[PDB]
């Protein structure tokens, strides 16, 4: 409903082309501090830490990258850097203390999307890859090497994979299908499809596992968000019988990204979407929009915690520009979302009412506040 | 040089401008008026929705301005207390040939019932050729006869200020000689960039100050009823004088904001003239100071100095008075806090746009108009603590 | 009458004329008080018995049965005239019978006339057997299968069979003269099978003369086709098969080459593939060249060493001698020291006896030997002895 | 005669003044010394003005008096500064006397604080041989550093003997203090300088050392310099400089200040622009404010060598315009990029030239990667190389021309294998990048956008028709028919291909079927029959394939749609003929992925032929051993050969030989004895156990394809002489046999 203008940002030098899915952020050295991971087509991966401009380190693989990620894949306990090339490859890097990898295993071709999580409830984290040809494939690191698992065949193209709490309270895997549609993949030890009209060939992106409380990030979900390239956004609640509709927003831009971030700091998470022309939307769970217009055309987008300055995690927004630069906005924290004033904010607390009753018309209140604020004596 | 605290200001809204504005674009109304160079004028406000507020920016269309013109200055005021009315004034330039044709428009709806209405004031134009390049539209109030009258002032390319007074008869605004009401505004050398006239409440005296492009700053003490100048003070600085303000810390003082020198404050005008200066430390490190302001920002009851620069900086300065008792630093100005912006800052205001008694800060920068509020949580507890300090003090200390 | 017409000509098929010769004479008492029409036929075949007897004798040194056989033509043409006669039926069966033997008589003077042409020839230096066969063919082509009623069967074949072997002989007498290896090899066998079938199963001059002719045919047959028979045989077993034949020249020349040690001998034949039997479709080629005069039969060592220009030189250059078929040529090589003894017993075949030692020109014993060889190879005796 | 009085203060300066007078006298009076104007002079005997009020006198004769008096006044005035102020000092034991003389630290002498300036200015009213002056205003006082830094450079370059000292005026203190800012404060300066080689020593100078032998003294002709500043006004004060050189230095100084004011202006303009005052302070608004102004050199090295909206909607001199020079370098580089994209767009859109590598790289940078597709190559064994590279290039060329068939144009990369294609649309430009690496062939699709969803929602159609799977399928199935028609063990590659694509996309046209066939092969071994068939595949209308080594059977024809059909056949268990076989279908009219009952029907004919070629052609495999056994049971084996063989009677080859077939049976019995005794090695005695049916065959030394048989059967009286065929060479066989058949007849006639 209102626009803002964030100022503080860092510019990172980056020369190369990439897919929209070849960027992320997470801890690779296991120091509870997130670092930025970017991977271009040319076969190199760059990590960014603190608020430098040059990459922290360069790790070289062989092929052409399509997906990168960081997570607990071997179930060994650490966090690991997974990089899957376009042709057939798959690499792990062991960044925790050039930079040749330490593993290599060929996989099916036409890799498009990557996800690391436990989708069954067995306590072991598996790796899921979607493909350009409506094929989804799950794996597992069998104590070692990566053995395969159930494969799902689809009709509409895939754009995003997400793991979210199911109706009964178990992990469930979603994939996106064109036409603002999605599909739940049957658990791996056949594929159900839901539709939410527009062109049937409309690209759709999905995100899930949005926090709702404070300290519930260990186990909790039920809300997931959808975006379409023609410029519509929706927030859906899982429930059991059907999917409850929370809010639907129609914009006039080409939406191609979808993430979640905590800017207010009250535990809840807010949906963050970006377009090709740089018009970013930030929406809470009560349909409150904040627009940031970075006057530039955008290739890739990212949103999440990042260790920017003085070694401390803070929410950050990351933009990749056609001008070979990456912008990190790190002072993006907001005091609140809506716009209010002192009178409305002070009317909530009953202490103000008690104080006024003990002290004995709105203009009178305004005069009292002016005298209290500007003429204390 | 190092901020002694964090900035308490949070940004609320941001309305983007298609084209840039200039220092004279800002004007009052509780509303606000901002004019772009290419003939587009916007009137800001806020609207109440049950339990929230919504910024509103509505564009205004004035009448006798050609599409090829280019606005230079804008000002406004309210008519003197005896007579109701709102007066607006715009000085633009018609692009008729290589030599532009300066003009001047004055808007006032004389019809009763909708005198204050801005829609009516949109089309009430009075056209007026200039014969000089206008610089700034200012207004002043003068005790004439037994009443008070508000008169315009307009710097011109000719080094003179042109007074435009209204007629109680044919109800127009005509130029009148300056010397009749403002004897201190004669015999200039450069073009007056900013001029400030400070009345003394409950008195027939006043103090006038001005600064020009050559760096010449002149302050004169004048009595109104006698129409006599009491004293003259003059200094010669460097760089254009982008701003001069007169404020009380008797015991009056001025703030001078040159575009190439640190902002300075001259103290004890009536008792020492323009000799005692306090230069604000390290305020020339952020490009060029463009705008300025003097108001209470910390809600303490004492003045603070706001300085907006071209390096996109919003430095705030506080006065360390003699009550602290440190002669090595007694009676000094220190940097309270500092903020950063995305675009160069051109103008500032200080107005309760919302209607809660707290004064929002409107900052006009090259890309648009920012509204900055005090951190509501920070301010929400000051009210309650000062109320608690005053309910117990009601009986315990004073029965 | 058919009851007594049982022996008839069937008894006359054999060379036993005695039965008919007396039966036809006693016919008067053998057909007592019968129809006086078969008596004429009985007298006709009685005289036919004598005509056949003299023909088998073939002596004729009144002379010649030419028209003395058509002396029996009035009866042969008028046995029938249409105790009276029953007429047609089994009485004109005699008329049907007579027509069988009319051309028997006719072709009989024709065959005795061919005999007489050979008898008149019986001379000169080269009898043309091919022209003889050409003259023959017409007689049996016109006599072919018009007497073919049952009771003529013994002689009806026998006469034809006779000229059959005669053809089989006469044609052969031509084919042997032209190096017809297999055609001559087969013609005798056709007669030989029928010869012992008829001749052996029981002799007039015809018989003895026919065996004489066929035997000298075999005698010269084993001689001319010597090399081909010798190679495919046993090493020294063929000289019993060529010791069972009258004038064997391989055995005879052996004595001359052993006693007097004749170190060279050959049989030249002016020009045909070569030795043996060849398929007609095989690559024949042409008998041309400066040495295209074969020496087919050589019975010492190989044919000379470097002395065979002068086996055709003294042949064409002295051809006035040998073409008389009644003389011998003789020359003397200056360096070779080889007195040739070429002599021509045949129109094409010639026998050279080249020596390696001095012979002068007074070796009369070998001259007599060559004369004896020629007098059994010219067909002199077989045609001279056409009558006792 | 004229006389002029002189003060006694210069009592011992009578010789020294004689120098200072001469330098003053020689100027106006060109050369007892005589001068021409005839003037003859002779020196005679008897607080600023008192000490020089014009006690020796001057005795002169004229053959002027004011000129004579003026020169004497100039003589003392010049000598006053030279002798009373010049020798004054400028400002471990030797480490301070040499340090105070330089004046780096300490304090300047009071002479050069209030007296020297006034005294030097004094000889501007009175004519003197060493004096100067200048002036300036400056629009502001930023320039004192920007003037002094270059003034020192100018002084040093003109004459390096002088060294500049800057003595500020320490706001708060007063004259006689010179120790080597604040807003609205009148800053001062005393930026003097001196040559230090003129102590212990008395063309750049104008005066002379007077006379060394003239009374034996050292004339104080030492030069000096002083550039004073009073707020906004500079005044030079020279001494003893060469006249033309001194005037040139003054002119250079005033021109330098003029340039500094010219840079002050054209910076005041930028400042006015900063607050949005374009109309009020324009360029050339008033020798450097003229319209032909080098507006980019005066925002650069400070020296004498549309703008009015320069930052519209976009040492303070080297700081406020050093950002202007960079602001107006972000648009001379945004247009060099913006025009290079519109040129190509216009050229490619309607106008249906080779572009360089840099332009293509820029086009790729300004575009987005929308989609890609990759497909493996299944011919190279290392991916389970000339043989691989040549096939890969043919694949590339075949795909390139397929892309052209739907409206794509190749991009001729200009010289300063990857291949790019283009297709221009109203929405924008679509670009492809075809390249092959390692084992996989991959294709990427860029897009450069230029009412807006008519390009991105139409760019997917170009993706839906890419067809990289079916194209590779068809290429693979067309790369086998050519090899069939003519190592690389084709069946293994076939199995690998079928494992890779068991199903097969529907956009291809070619098809394949793999099957196996089992043949009985009861009598002969399957492994032996396969080898035997492989030797005589030509008689089988087939062809072998040298793939340890294995052989493969192929066929071909042109069935019709679906065009050519190609087969490839490869081999208790010893009597099982497992026959692997394939059926390959290929199209001819459509060589591109245009967007199986024929295969099943063809498979039927293939199976029928695979049946026939064994079930009927296996009889000649065992018959080869039958014509080897009858070379060197056996009586029963002979009847088997005659069961299936060509035989003709002897009457069918020569008409003559029909005679033999009509004669005695005993003759053959007689015949058979001869050959057995004549040719034992060639004759082969076969006879029945009851001897009723006796056989006899003669062999050939070379004519192995035809044999002659002798048959005798006494029991029924039947017999025959025929020739069995498995023609020229057969006649030679009928030669050696024939002569014996008539020689036995010869033995009969006798």
From Swiss-Prot, chain A:
Q: What's a GO cellular component annotated to this UniProt protein? A: KICSTOR complex
Annotated compartments: Lysosome membrane
Pfam families from the UniProt entry: Itfg2 (PF15907)
What do we know about how this protein assembles, alone or with others?
A: Part of the KICSTOR complex composed of KPTN, ITFG2, KICS2 and SZT2. SZT2 probably serves as a link between the other three proteins in the KICSTOR complex and may mediate the direct interaction with the GATOR complex via GATOR1. The KICSTOR complex interacts directly with the GATOR1 complex and most probably indirectly with the GATOR2 complex in an amino acid-independent manner.
Name the record gives this protein: KICSTOR complex protein ITFG2
Q: Which UniProt keywords apply?
A: Lysosome, Membrane, Phosphoprotein, Repeat
Is the Repeat keyword given for this protein? yes
Q: What does this protein do?
A: As part of the KICSTOR complex functions in the amino acid-sensing branch of the TORC1 signaling pathway. Recruits, in an amino acid-independent manner, the GATOR1 complex to the lysosomal membranes and allows its interaction with GATOR2 and the RAG GTPases. Functions upstream of the RAG GTPases and is required to negatively regulate mTORC1 signaling in absence of amino acids. In absence of the KICSTOR complex mTORC1 is constitutively localized to the lysosome and activated. The KICSTOR complex is also probably involved in the regulation of mTORC1 by glucose.
Key word Phosphoprotein present:
yes
Give the chief site where it resides. membrane
FG-GAP-type repeats, residues: 19-48, 110-139
- Coiled-coil annotation: which residues? none
Q: Which InterPro entries match?
A: Integrin_alpha_N, KICSTOR_ITFG2, WD40_repeat_dom_sf
Query: What is the gene called?
Result: ITFG2
UniProtKB/Swiss-Prot annotation, chain B:
What is the species of this protein?
Homo sapiens
Top-level taxon of the source organism: Eukaryota
Q: Which SUPFAM superfamilies match?
A: Integrin alpha N-terminal domain (SSF69318)
UniProt KW keywords: Acetylation, Actin-binding, Cell projection, Disease variant, Intellectual disability, Lysosome, Membrane
Q: Which gene encodes it?
A: KPTN
**What does the subunit section of this Swiss-Prot or TrEMBL entry state?**
Part of the KICSTOR complex composed of KPTN, ITFG2, KICS2 and SZT2. SZT2 probably serves as a link between the other three proteins in the KICSTOR complex and mediates the direct interaction with the GATOR1 complex. May associate with F-actin filaments.
| Summary of the function given for this chain in its UniProt record | As part of the KICSTOR complex functions in the amino acid-sensing branch of the TORC1 signaling pathway. Recruits, in an amino acid-independent manner, the GATOR1 complex to the lysosomal membranes and allows its interaction with GATOR2 and the RAG GTPases. Functions upstream of the RAG GTPases and is required to negatively regulate mTORC1 signaling in absence of amino acids. In absence of the KICSTOR complex mTORC1 is constitutively localized to the lysosome and activated. The KICSTOR complex is also probably involved in the regulation of mTORC1 by glucose.
> What's the protein here called?
KICSTOR complex protein kaptin
> Mind telling me which GO cellular component terms the entry cites?
glutamatergic synapse; KICSTOR complex; lamellipodium; lysosomal membrane; postsynaptic actin cytoskeleton; stereocilium
Curated annotation (Swiss-Prot), chain C:
Question: What effect is documented for mutating residue 248 to E?
Answer: In MRT83; uncertain significance; decreased interaction with SZT2
UniProt disease link: Intellectual developmental disorder, autosomal recessive 83: An autosomal recessive disorder characterized by developmental delay, mild to moderate intellectual disability, and poor or absent speech. Additional variable features include seizures, hearing impairment, hypotonia, and non-specific facial dysmorphism.
Keyword Membrane, does the record have it? yes
Single Gene Ontology BP annotation: protein localization to lysosome
What is the similarity comment for this entry?
Answer: Belongs to the KICS2 family.
What are the record's GO terms for cellular component? Answer: intercellular bridge; KICSTOR complex; lysosomal membrane; lysosome
Q: What is this protein called?
A: KICSTOR subunit 2
Q: Which UniProt keywords are given for this protein, alphabetically ordered? A: Disease variant, Intellectual disability, Lysosome, Membrane
What is the purpose of this protein? As part of the KICSTOR complex functions in the amino acid-sensing branch of the TORC1 signaling pathway. Recruits, in an amino acid-independent manner, the GATOR1 complex to the lysosomal membranes and allows its interaction with GATOR2 and the RAG GTPases. Functions upstream of the RAG GTPases and is required to negatively regulate mTORC1 signaling in absence of amino acids. In absence of the KICSTOR complex mTORC1 is constitutively localized to the lysosome and activated. The KICSTOR complex is also probably involved in the regulation of mTORC1 by glucose.
Domain of life, per the record? Eukaryota
Compartments annotated for it: namely: Lysosome membrane
Q: What is the originating organism of this protein?
A: Homo sapiens
From Swiss-Prot, chain D:
Q: Where in the cell is it found?
A: Lysosome membrane; Peroxisome
Q: In which tissues is it expressed?
A: Expressed in the brain, predominantly in the parietal and frontal cortex, as well as in dorsal root ganglia. Expressed in peripheral white blood cells.
User: Its function?
Assistant: As part of the KICSTOR complex functions in the amino acid-sensing branch of the TORC1 signaling pathway. Recruits, in an amino acid-independent manner, the GATOR1 complex to the lysosomal membranes and allows its interaction with GATOR2 and the RAG GTPases. Functions upstream of the RAG GTPases and is required to negatively regulate mTORC1 signaling in absence of amino acids. In absence of the KICSTOR complex mTORC1 is constitutively localized to the lysosome and activated. The KICSTOR complex is also probably involved in the regulation of mTORC1 by glucose.
Disease implication from the record: Developmental and epileptic encephalopathy 18: A severe autosomal recessive neurologic disorder characterized by lack of psychomotor development apparent from birth, dysmorphic facial features, early onset of refractory seizures, and thick corpus callosum and persistent cavum septum pellucidum on brain imaging.
Give the protein's recorded name: KICSTOR complex protein SZT2
What's the source species for this entry? Answer: Homo sapiens (Human)
Q: What gene name is given for the protein in this entry?
A: SZT2
């Amino acid at each position: 409903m209102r626009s803002v203008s964030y100022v503080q940002r860092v510019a990172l030098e980056f020369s190369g082309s990439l897919f929209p899915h070849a960027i992320c952020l997470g801890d690779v050295d296991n120091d509870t501090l997130n670092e930025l991971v970017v991977g271009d087509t040319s076969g190199k991966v760059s990590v960014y830490k603190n608020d430098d401009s040059r990459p922290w380190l360069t790790c070289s693989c062989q092929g052409m990258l399509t997906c990168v990620g960081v997570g607990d894949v071997c179930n060994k306990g650490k966090n690991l850097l997974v990089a899957v090339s376009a042709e057939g490859w798959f690499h792990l890097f062991d960044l925790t203390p050039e930079q040749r990898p330490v593993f290599k295993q060929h996989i099916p071709a036409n890799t498009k999307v990557m996800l690391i999580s436990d989708i069954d409830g067995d306590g072991c984290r598996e790796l899921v890859v979607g493909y350009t040809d409506r094929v989804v494939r799950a794996f597992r690191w069998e104590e070692g090497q990566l053995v395969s698992l159930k494969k799902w065949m689809l009709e509409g193209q895939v754009d995003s994979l997400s793991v979210t709490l199911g109706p009964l309270g178990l992990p469930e895997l979603m994939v996106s299908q064109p036409g603002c549609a999605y599909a739940i993949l049957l658990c791996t030890w056949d594929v159900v499809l839901h539709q939410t009209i527009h062109n049937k060939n409309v690209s759709t992106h999905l995100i899930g596992n949005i926090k709702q409380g404070h300290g519930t990030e260990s186990s909790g979900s039920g809300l997931f968000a959808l975006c379409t390239l023609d410029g519509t956004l929706k927030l859906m609640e899982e429930m059991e019988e059907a999917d409850k509709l929370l809010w639907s927003v129609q914009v006039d831009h080409q939406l191609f990204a979808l993430e979640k971030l905590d800017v207010t700091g009250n535990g809840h998470e807010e949906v963050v979407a970006c377009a090709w022309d740089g018009q970013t939307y930030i929406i809470d769970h009560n349909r409150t929009v904040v627009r940031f217009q970075v006057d530039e055309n955008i290739r890739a987008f990212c949103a999440g915690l990042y260790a920017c300055k003085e070694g401390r995690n803070s929410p950050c927004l990351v933009y990749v520009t056609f001008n070979q630069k990456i912008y990190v906005y790190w002072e993006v924290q907001l005091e609140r979302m809506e716009s209010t004033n002192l009178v409305k904010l002070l009317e909530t607390k009953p202490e103000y009412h008690s104080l006024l009753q003990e002290l004995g018309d709105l203009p009178v209140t305004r005069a009292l506040l002016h005298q209290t604020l500007y003429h204390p004596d | 040089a190092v901020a002694a605290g964090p900035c308490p200001l949070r940004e609320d809204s941001f309305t983007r401008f298609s084209s840039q504005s200039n220092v004279y674009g800002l004007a009052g109304g509780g509303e606000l008026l901002a004019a772009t160079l290419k003939g587009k004028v916007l009137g800001f406000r806020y609207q109440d929705l049950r339990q929230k507020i919504r910024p509103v920016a509505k564009e205004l269309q004035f009448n006798y301005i050609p599409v090829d013109a280019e606005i230079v200055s804008i000002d406004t005021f309210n008519k003197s207390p005896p007579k109701r009315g709102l007066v607006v004034g715009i000085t633009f330039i018609k692009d008729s040939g290589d030599k532009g044709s300066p003009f001047l428009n004055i808007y006032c709806d004389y019809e009763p019932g909708s005198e204050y209405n801005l829609d009516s004031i949109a089309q009430s134009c009075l056209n007026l050729e200039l014969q000089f390049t206008p610089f700034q539209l200012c207004h002043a109030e003068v005790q004439v006869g037994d009443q008070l009258e508000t008169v315009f002032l307009l710097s011109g390319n000719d080094p003179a200020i042109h007074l435009y007074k209204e007629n109680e008869g044919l109800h127009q605004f005509e130029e009148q000689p300056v010397e009749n009401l403002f004897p201190e505004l004669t015999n200039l050398t450069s073009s007056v960039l900013w001029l400030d006239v400070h009345n003394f409440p409950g008195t027939s005296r006043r103090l006038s100050a001005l600064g020009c492009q050559s760096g010449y700053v002149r302050v004169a003490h004048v009595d109104q009823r006698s129409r006599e100048v009491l004293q003259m003070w003059s200094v010669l600085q460097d760089g254009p004088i982008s701003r001069v303000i007169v404020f009380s810390l008797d015991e009056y003082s001025v703030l001078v904001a040159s575009m190439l020198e640190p902002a300075v404050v001259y103290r004890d005008l009536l008792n020492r003239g323009l000799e005692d200066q306090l230069l604000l430390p390290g305020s020339d490190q952020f490009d060029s100071v463009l705008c300025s302001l003097v108001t209470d920002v910390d809600l303490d009851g004492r003045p603070e100095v706001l300085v907006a620069t071209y390096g996109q900086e919003l430095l705030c300065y506080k006065y360390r008075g003699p009550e602290s008792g440190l002669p090595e630093a007694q009676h000094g100005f220190h940097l309270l806090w500092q903020r950063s912006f995305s675009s160069p800052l051109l103008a500032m205001a200080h107005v309760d746009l919302t209607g809660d008694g707290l004064q929002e800060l409107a900052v006009v920068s090259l890309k648009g108009v920012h509204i900055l509020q005090h951190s509501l949580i920070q301010a929400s507890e000051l009210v309650l603590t000062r109320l608690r300090h005053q309910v117990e003090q009601r009986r315990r200390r004073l029965q | 009458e058919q009851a007594v017409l049982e022996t008839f000509f069937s008894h006359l098929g054999i060379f036993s004329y005695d039965k008919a010769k007396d039966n036809v004479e006693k016919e008067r008492e053998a057909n007592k008080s019968a129809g006086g029409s078969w008596l004429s036929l009985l007298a006709a075949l009685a005289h036919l018995a004598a005509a056949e007897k003299v023909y088998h004798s073939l002596t004729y040194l009144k002379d010649s049965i030419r028209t003395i056989y058509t002396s029996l033509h009035n009866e042969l043409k008028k046995v029938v005239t249409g105790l009276g006669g029953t007429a047609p039926h089994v009485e004109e069966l005699l008329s049907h019978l007579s027509e069988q033997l009319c051309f028997f008589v006719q072709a009989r003077m024709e065959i005795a006339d061919f005999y007489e042409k050979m008898y008149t020839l019986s001379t000169q230096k080269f009898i043309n057997a091919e022209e003889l066969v050409g003259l023959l063919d017409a007689i049996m082509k016109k006599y072919s299968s018009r007497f073919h009623h049952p009771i003529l069967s013994p002689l009806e074949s026998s006469f034809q069979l006779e000229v059959d072997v005669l053809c089989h002989l006469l044609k052969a007498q031509a084919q042997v003269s032209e190096w017809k290896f297999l055609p001559s090899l087969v013609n005798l066998h056709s007669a030989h099978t029928k010869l012992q079938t008829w001749g052996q199963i029981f002799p007039p001059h015809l018989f003895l003369w026919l065996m004489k002719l066929k035997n000298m045919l075999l005698a010269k047959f084993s001689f001319y086709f010597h090399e081909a028979l010798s190679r495919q045989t046993t090493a020294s077993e063929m000289k019993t098969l060529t010791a069972k034949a009258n004038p064997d020249f391989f055995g005879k020349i052996s004595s001359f080459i052993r006693k007097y040690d004749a170190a060279n001998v050959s049989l030249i034949f002016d020009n045909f593939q070569g030795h043996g039997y060849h398929h007609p479709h095989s690559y024949r080629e042409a008998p041309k060249g400066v040495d295209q005069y074969p020496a087919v039969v050589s019975l010492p060592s190989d044919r000379p060493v470097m002395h065979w220009p002068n086996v055709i030189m003294i042949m064409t250059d002295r051809t006035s001698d040998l073409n008389s078929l009644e003389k011998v040529v003789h020359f003397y090589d200056d360096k070779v020291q080889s007195t040739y003894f070429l002599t021509r017993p045949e129109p094409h075949f010639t026998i050279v006896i080249i020596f390696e030692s001095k012979k002068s020109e007074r070796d009369s014993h070998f001259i007599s030997f060559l004369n004896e060889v020629s007098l059994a190879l010219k067909n002199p005796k077989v045609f001279a002895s056409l009558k006792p | 005669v004229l006389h002029l009085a002189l003060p006694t203060s210069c009592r011992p300066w009578l010789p020294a003044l004689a120098w200072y007078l001469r330098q003053n006298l020689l100027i106006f009076l060109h050369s007892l010394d005589i001068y021409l104007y005839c003037i003859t002079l002779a020196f005679v005997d008897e607080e600023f003005e008192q000490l020089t009020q014009v006690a020796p006198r001057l005795r002169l004769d004229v053959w002027l008096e004011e000129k004579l008096r003026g020169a004497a006044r100039q003589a003392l005035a010049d000598a006053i500064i030279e002798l009373q102020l010049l020798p004054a000092s400028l400002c471990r034991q030797k480490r301070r006397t040499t340090q105070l003389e330089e004046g780096e630290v300490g304090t300047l002498h009071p002479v050069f604080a209030r007296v020297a300036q006034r005294w030097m200015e004094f000889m501007v009213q009175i004519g003197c041989a060493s004096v100067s002056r200048s002036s300036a205003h400056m629009v502001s006082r930023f320039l004192l550093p920007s003037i002094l830094s270059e003034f020192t450079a100018l002084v040093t370059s003109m004459a390096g003997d002088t060294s500049v000292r800057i003595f500020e005026q320490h706001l708060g203190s007063e004259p006689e203090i010179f120790g080597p800012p604040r807003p609205a404060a009148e800053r001062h300066l005393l930026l003097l300088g001196r040559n230090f080689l003129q102590w212990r020593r008395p063309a750049m100078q104008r005066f002379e050392p007077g006379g060394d032998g003239s009374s034996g003294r050292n004339a104080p002709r030492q030069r000096l310099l002083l550039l004073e500043v009073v707020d906004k006004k500079l005044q030079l004060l020279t001494y003893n400089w060469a006249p033309d050189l001194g005037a040139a230095l003054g002119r250079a100084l005033v021109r330098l200040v003029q340039w500094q004011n010219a840079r002050a202006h054209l910076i005041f303009c930028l400042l006015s622009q900063k607050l949005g005052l374009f109309h009020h302070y324009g360029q050339l608004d008033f020798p450097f404010l003229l319209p032909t102004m080098e507006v980019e050199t005066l925002i650069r090295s400070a020296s004498p060598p549309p703008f009015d909206e320069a930052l519209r909607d976009i040492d303070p001199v080297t700081y406020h315009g050093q950002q202007f020079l960079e602001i107006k370098m972000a648009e001379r580089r945004e247009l060099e990029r913006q025009m290079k994209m519109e040129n190509l767009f216009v050229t490619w859109q309607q106008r249906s030239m080779p572009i360089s590598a840099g332009e293509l790289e820029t086009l790729k940078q300004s575009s987005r990667l929308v989609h890609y597709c990759a497909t493996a190559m299944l011919f190279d064994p290392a991916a389970w190389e000339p043989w691989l590279k040549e096939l890969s290039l043919a694949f590339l060329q075949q795909y390139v021309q397929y892309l052209q068939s739907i409206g794509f144009v190749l991009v001729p990369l200009r010289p300063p294998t990857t291949y790019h294609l283009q297709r221009a649309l109203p929405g924008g430009i679509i670009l492809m990048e075809l390249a092959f690496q390692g084992c996989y062939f991959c294709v990427k699709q860029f897009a450069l956008e230029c009412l807006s969803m008519l390009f991105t929602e139409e760019c997917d159609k170009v993706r839906d028709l890419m067809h990289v799977h079916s194209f590779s399928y068809d290429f693979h199935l067309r790369l086998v028919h050519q090899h069939v028609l003519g190592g690389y063990h084709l069946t293994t590659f076939l199995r690998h291909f079928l494992a890779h694509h068991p199903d097969g996309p529907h956009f291809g046209r070619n098809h394949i079927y793999q099957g196996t066939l089992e043949l009985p092969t009861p009598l002969i071994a399957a492994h032996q029959l396969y080898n035997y068939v492989a030797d005589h595949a030509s008689s089988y209308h087939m062809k072998p394939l040298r793939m340890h080594n294995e052989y493969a059977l192929v066929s071909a024809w042109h069935s019709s749609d679906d065009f050519d059909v190609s087969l490839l056949v490869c081999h208790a268990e010893r009597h099982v003929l497992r026959l692997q076989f394939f059926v390959v279908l290929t199209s001819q009219r459509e060589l591109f992925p245009r967007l199986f009952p024929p295969l099943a029907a063809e498979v039927g004919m293939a199976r029928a032929r695979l049946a026939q070629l064994v079930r009927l052609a296996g009889g000649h495999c065992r018959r080869d051993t039958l014509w080897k056994r009858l070379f060197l049971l056996a009586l029963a084996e002979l009847e088997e050969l005659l069961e299936a063989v060509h035989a003709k009677s002897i009457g069918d080859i020569d008409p003559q030989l029909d005679c033999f077939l009509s004669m005695t049976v005993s003759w053959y019995q007689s015949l058979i004895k001869v050959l057995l005794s004549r040719f034992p090695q060639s004759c082969r005695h076969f006879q029945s156990p009851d001897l009723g049916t006796q056989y006899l065959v003669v062999l050939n030394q070379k004519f192995t394809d035809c044999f002659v048989l002798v048959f005798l059967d006494s029991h029924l009286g039947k017999t025959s002489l025929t020739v069995v065929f498995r023609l020229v060479s057969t006649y030679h066989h009928l030669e050696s046999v024939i002569n014996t058949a008539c020689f036995t007849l010869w033995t009969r006639l006798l």
